[PDB]
Design a protein around this ligand. Sequence first.
Ligand code: SF4
Ligand code: SF4
Ligand code: SF4
Ligand code: SF4
Ligand code: SF4
Ligand code: SF4
Ligand code: SF4
Lengths: 169, 169, 762, 761
Amino acid sequence: VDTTKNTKLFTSYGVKTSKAITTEVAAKLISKAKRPLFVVGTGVLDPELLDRAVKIAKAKNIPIAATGSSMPGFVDKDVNAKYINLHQLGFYLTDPDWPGLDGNGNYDTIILLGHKKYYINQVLSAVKNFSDVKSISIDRNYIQNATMSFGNLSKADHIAALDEVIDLL
Amino acid sequence: VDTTKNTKLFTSYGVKTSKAITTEVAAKLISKAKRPLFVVGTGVLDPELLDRAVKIAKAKNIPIAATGSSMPGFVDKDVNAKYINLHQLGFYLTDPDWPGLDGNGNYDTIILLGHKKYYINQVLSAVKNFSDVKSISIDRNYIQNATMSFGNLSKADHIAALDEVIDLL
Amino acid sequence: GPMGPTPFPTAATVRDWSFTLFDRYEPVYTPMCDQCCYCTFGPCNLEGNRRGACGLDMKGQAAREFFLRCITGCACHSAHGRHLLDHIISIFGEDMPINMGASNVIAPNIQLITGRQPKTLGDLKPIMEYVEEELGQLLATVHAGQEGAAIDYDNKAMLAGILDHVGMEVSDIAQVTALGFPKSDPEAPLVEVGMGTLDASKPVIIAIGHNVAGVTYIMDYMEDNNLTDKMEIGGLCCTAFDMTRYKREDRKPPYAKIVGTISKELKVVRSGIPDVIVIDEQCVRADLVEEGKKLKIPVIASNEKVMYGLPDRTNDDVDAIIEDIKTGKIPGCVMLDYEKLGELVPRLAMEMAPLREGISAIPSDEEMASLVAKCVACGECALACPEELDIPDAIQAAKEGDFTALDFLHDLCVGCRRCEQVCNKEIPILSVIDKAAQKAIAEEKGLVRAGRGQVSDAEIRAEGLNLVMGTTPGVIAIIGCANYPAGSKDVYRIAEEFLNRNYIVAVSGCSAMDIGMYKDADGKTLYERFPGRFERGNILNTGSCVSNSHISGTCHKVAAIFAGRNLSGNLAEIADYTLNRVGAVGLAWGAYSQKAAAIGTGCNMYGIPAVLGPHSGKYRRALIAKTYDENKWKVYDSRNGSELDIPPSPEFLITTAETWQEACVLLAKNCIRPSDNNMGRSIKLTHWIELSEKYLGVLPEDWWKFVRHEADLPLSRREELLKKLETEHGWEIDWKKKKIISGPKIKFDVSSQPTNLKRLCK
Amino acid sequence: GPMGPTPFPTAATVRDWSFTLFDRYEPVYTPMCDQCCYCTFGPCNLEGNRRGACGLDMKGQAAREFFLRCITGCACHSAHGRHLLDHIISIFGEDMPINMGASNVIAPNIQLITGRQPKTLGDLKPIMEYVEEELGQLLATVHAGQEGAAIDYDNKAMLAGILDHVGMEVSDIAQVTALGFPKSDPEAPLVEVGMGTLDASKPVIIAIGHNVAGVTYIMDYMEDNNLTDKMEIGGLCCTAFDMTRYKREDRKPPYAKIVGTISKELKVVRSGIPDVIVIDEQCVRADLVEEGKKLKIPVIASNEKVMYGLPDRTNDDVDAIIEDIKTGKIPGCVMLDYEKLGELVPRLAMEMAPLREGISAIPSDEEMASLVAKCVACGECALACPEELDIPDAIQAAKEGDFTALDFLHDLCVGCRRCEQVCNKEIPILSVIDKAAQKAIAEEKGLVRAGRGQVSDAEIRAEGLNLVMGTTPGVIAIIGCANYPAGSKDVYRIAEEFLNRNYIVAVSGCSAMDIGMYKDADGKTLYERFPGRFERGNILNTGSCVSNSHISGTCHKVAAIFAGRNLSGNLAEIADYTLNRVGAVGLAWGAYSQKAAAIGTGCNMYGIPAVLGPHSGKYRRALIAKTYDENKWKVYDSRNGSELDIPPSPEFLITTAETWQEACVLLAKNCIRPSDNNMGRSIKLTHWIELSEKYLGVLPEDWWKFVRHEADLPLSRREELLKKLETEHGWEIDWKKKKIISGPKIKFDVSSQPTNLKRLC
Ligand code: SF4
Ligand code: SF4
Ligand code: SF4
Ligand code: SF4
Ligand code: SF4
Ligand code: SF4
Ligand code: SF4
């Protein structure tokens, strides 16, 4: 289940690179967040991914930004989720004065799950270069532009890692 | 002295980076090489680097290609140093039909010392991406385009690593 | 007669309008890299918004890169237009009048930008000149140490976009007037599209590119010798539309066929279908010779832009070239003489058809079984796939006689070969996918409407009434390239959804080809289900890429017809009018090229919002507005000059979307305009709420921000929404009259005239 | 008149000549980046010559990048020319006769390329038009899927380079015939150049850029208001040279000063000297507003290409703008009205001089003692330094009281502050270095001869014999920017060494003003020591790099005035003549910009080899010949049409050298042409062997290839070289009467004519 193994890329965004963290470090970083925002994508509609995302969000009462067409999954659920565009969210996160979804203020750390690499990397470029909002990627693809991320994982390995993170939250 | 602890770079050519190697590994590679070439630049006119390079060349009878203004440092040293332009050498190493400096043929691996990082990296881009010639950079800097390269070191640690390589050849 | 303030504009003249746009729609930079490779002082690490050796920060670098893409697209359009215009004037004479259609303004973009009113063909000659001159100036800005601020690169990119639109309009006007293209015909002939439309029992010529000059000669030679009934000619990319519009103003069915978009470019070559390949200018794969020589498929260059490193046989005899290509060392030649090319290509195809028979890259069944058994699931192909397809899972499934995963992956794949070059086993994954989807390819047949040209000044008037009486919810312009994230069916789904709700859908480029490819359960396509008129519930295909200048021009005509505004040198006025009143949104789902960037930027400078595919985030620049900041949503009333509030729509000038449901919701929401009356606002709110509920499970949270009147609400759920307004928002409402008496922050007043310019206020 | 076979050349018209050139000089691709990022299909990894999603490989991508750089430079020069021509026509009309001096071929490049001989200032209007058209037809090739062969990209890049020499030619022609520049003057006035040549108690106006269009208005305002003595006007980059040459056909010394090259820009800003800065178009740092605002330095942008995001106040009153700038409400302004700008800049400088006294970024001694002690030697600055300087070692030495390390670093530093952005201690390393080198900055004074323009017909006629025959050992054209690898003295040393050897040295651009910064024991520069005629031993300055075409044009005149060849539309034949018979070589020791790449490519199409600095290895493409292949050195005879063997010189069309000694050896070796007689070859071989033995320390390993007769060797070493030929290569040489019986590979023939074109034999 070791996630920090396959730190392999096809192209590089430069010298600065994401940190490949284990399940324990990811759980600690999620539990220590001052104001986390669970940024989720349309790729979470897989039943295992959806169940694990709901459990992760409800474990720490994390509000969800359901970017893309991922809102229909959370309508029947209980987690507080709101819809927003990923590009618009990336633009807003670089603004310290943004009230946010609840109006309580801008966020600190964003958790990413269920995204396409060429899209989330492009948004994270702006987010990580023009702001101080940290990003934790619990997806099965190694995201370079995130502050912390999992390594390249199999789907079964990703499911196991998500389950372990749930049991360690 | 450990030569594989500092691999910091300012920019990156791409995903494929040079392998950080130790003194013993470099000594083994130089000993195993069949028809090596010692490509030295105008930076081997240092009082210490010249001695290390002369010892390395005499240990395994490696022919020397002096680029820039390093030829006067081999005028009376009892070696097989010959002058050649580094850009011309980098172009010729990609041609398998090259008679070579000695007149027998082309080479298999080239050892680099006393080079400027940007110039040697640019020259090695063509060799790495358009030929099958291995590269062993033993210089103070971490050359990315080389096959195997010493990590970033101080001058004293560079001298210590070169002496350790010589005493193990 | 009357001229505006900005004729023949430059970077300084359009600076005010671009800056006004950027104050509301802030630029968002998503850099594609942390380094600069431009000059020997570099490469410079600009990560963390650091500065290079020239003092340029990363925002400036991203702006400069996007500006370079825009000017490259503008240069492509302008150079194609210049070559076409020169050839047309050489052959047909410089005194030929412009015959574009039944219209009052025949060159809306030329009049809007330059201020001139061309009449003949030679009148287009100065305009092109102006563009090229400006290009040089703009190209000078790509030099190191040529600008410090990113806003000054964005303004120059906007200028590049509008110049690009001028170039496309010049090119399309020249080609339509000269080569007898359809002139605003709502009943343009239908043409077959798909790989399963080329009969392999005849010699096949395949034309790839964007020009039509040599293609016209090829067709003329085919027609003169009566070879049209025994030789099949197909077009890839926009040259297919250009060849299927050739002399098709009489609506006779065309013998030319359309193969597909750029994605099919390699796949057809892999199938052995083509017998001769001709390449003109652009959107041409740079390895066609590499994969064609293996199959003995001659490749012929026809333009000085693309010589493909081939020998130049221009001054020679056709028989010797034919003999050398047939049995010799050269896989093709550069044939810059158009008559010689038009004579050589048919004879070469005829003499090569019986000699390349039975050659294709499709593996045998046993060969494909061995290939699928060779894999070890190392994951490199999935890592190198631009669309991130799950190739190893498909290969593992197919190891046990399950060839349907590759069949599914065929539509999503773009035929880019990048997976093959990282496979240590040398497995031709592209050919494996083609073999698995052979039957589906054989089933691929569709119909598309030929390029009508521009929209006539009668259909615009016929549709203005429908747009003001709340029956046409807006205009959706589906354009762009074919680098789709999830296959070519997304554009079809979006177009079908918006046509079912009686929008005005206008299509062009590769998107039209990939929309006209999915037959319905009744065996019909969208172009046959809905007519090609400019009216609600109708879909019209303007034509090739250079036809997009008409779509934007349509918007300008709306300003020049119903408002009577001057077009000559009135970029700011007409752009403000379009931004505040005309409901039109562009959609580029698969845009990859710099031409698409130029078209989108030019549309943005005209005030038309655009939604692009998820890949377009690699363009490094978007334009998004801050909804929460209420001080960035104020205009001036053109009668009083006082400050007036507007609804936050459109909320972006260019943006990206991940899935097609999100694109549908964004397109529906962004059709709203501040000046909409009760009926138009009501219908737009109805469709936006319905789409949001259908594709997101929830209804929007900002709907109340667009309700100025009790007539603004949808008809079906008026009471259900008024109760929510009273309860959730606390608004004051009267129940006997079903009237909102208080609560809106903007009182409805149809006579109000929003403006972003203080120089046009009483 | 009689017109050649290439009227207004395009990609196909020059395809054969480019292919012929690349048959002998293969393109060597050294890509700067392993990914292609042009379109959204990417980023495509091309490592290992793998092809991208569009089929383009890594070699093709490198060729495309180099072509993009070349067209960028060409468009920059052509836009400068178009703007200058439009503005000059808006004043002097369009029928003003062209007067570049005493000659008959006024425009050599124009006549060579377009086959036209313009005689009025408006006659250059069509030429630009042609160029603009071609520019578009080249930029469209940058689009994805518009070309898939590296060789065709190289051909298009060479075409862009020549269209860049045409644009420079027109630019210089207009700005010389209009503004009253020196007209091929061999006695141009000397000009003070350097850091310390400027005053500090007077108002200071610093002009950065390349367009002498608002600088002219400023200068007229200062001369007609008697302000030439009450204030100082200094210029950076080529606008300094153009400002100096302005109104200087009367040979009187100018009052305007030259501060330095681009590498000095931020330095000047950090010194606090300027009281106003005006930036025109080119080679302008992108952070001047920030530093100037930190030091309260007004910034004025007087062009459309450079605006900086500053407010456009062209229609606003001069007094209101001056008051707003003085009260610190705006950091600067944009003024496109030249008449307004010429009054605003001097008035603003005069009003702001008594408002920023004692304001500078130079640290005090106690502050430079605190900042030096702040460092902990983490090594990030040395990693981020483009020139790879041992900054932590120098700072450590400074911690011991020795500040000579930073003083030595000062000359090598190009002043880019890239280090200061990676220091976690926030140490102004550039400011510290400048403080440690203040004692040498105070002495930074020198003399440079202003741009002469072109070469008169008399000089060309006189020197044609010595050039084609070889009596003059060669021509060295020192051009390029100031991105030097190891300081700015290398170019001075090279120029001095070659001037001492009876060579003709021609300089331009930043190198021209950097050569004259160093003096001998008498305290006089090379310009003062050697004269400025087109003759052996003399050094001439052409001024701005838009005058660089003149040097190339000079070669064309040698091919036309002496040999009687026809210039009109004869690019291939003239380039063949220059490659086969004219001994010339260019040196760009600090080339960094796209303009330098375009100039070099255009020179390579004309047959002039170029040696560039090591940083130029980042240009991604060189042209090198295979010296071990005998099949690459065969030409034909213009009298018989039969095969003929030639010596392997030049061994390249463009290349790079690590050090200036290697550069000297390369320039000595590459000045040898197949057509030189015994005397010319003897002089060239003498110089080459002497330079090799002095610098590389060993006699060359292929000199015996460049010998065909017993008179081909130096007279002082002829017996020794006969012995050396006999004992190693075993040749037959008669010792009684010194003569080679046998052994050489090419037999001498004075009347032999070498050509690389089969259609001209
Ligand atoms: S943008 Fe592309 S070419 Fe430029 S530095 Fe980044 S990877 Fe290299
Ligand atoms: S243009 Fe500027 S940022 Fe880019 S490499 Fe050159 S100095 Fe560095
Ligand atoms: S790259 Fe080849 S071997 Fe590796 S997983 Fe893909 S198909 Fe299998
Ligand atoms: S050819 Fe198709 S499957 Fe292979 S990498 Fe390209 S898009 Fe992916
Ligand atoms: S231009 Fe070609 S190689 Fe470059 S990113 Fe696009 S598809 Fe890849
Ligand atoms: S970066 Fe700063 S702290 Fe580090 S070595 Fe350089 S000067 Fe010292
Ligand atoms: S400012 Fe000077 S010392 Fe600092 S990085 Fe630039 S060149 Fe090196």
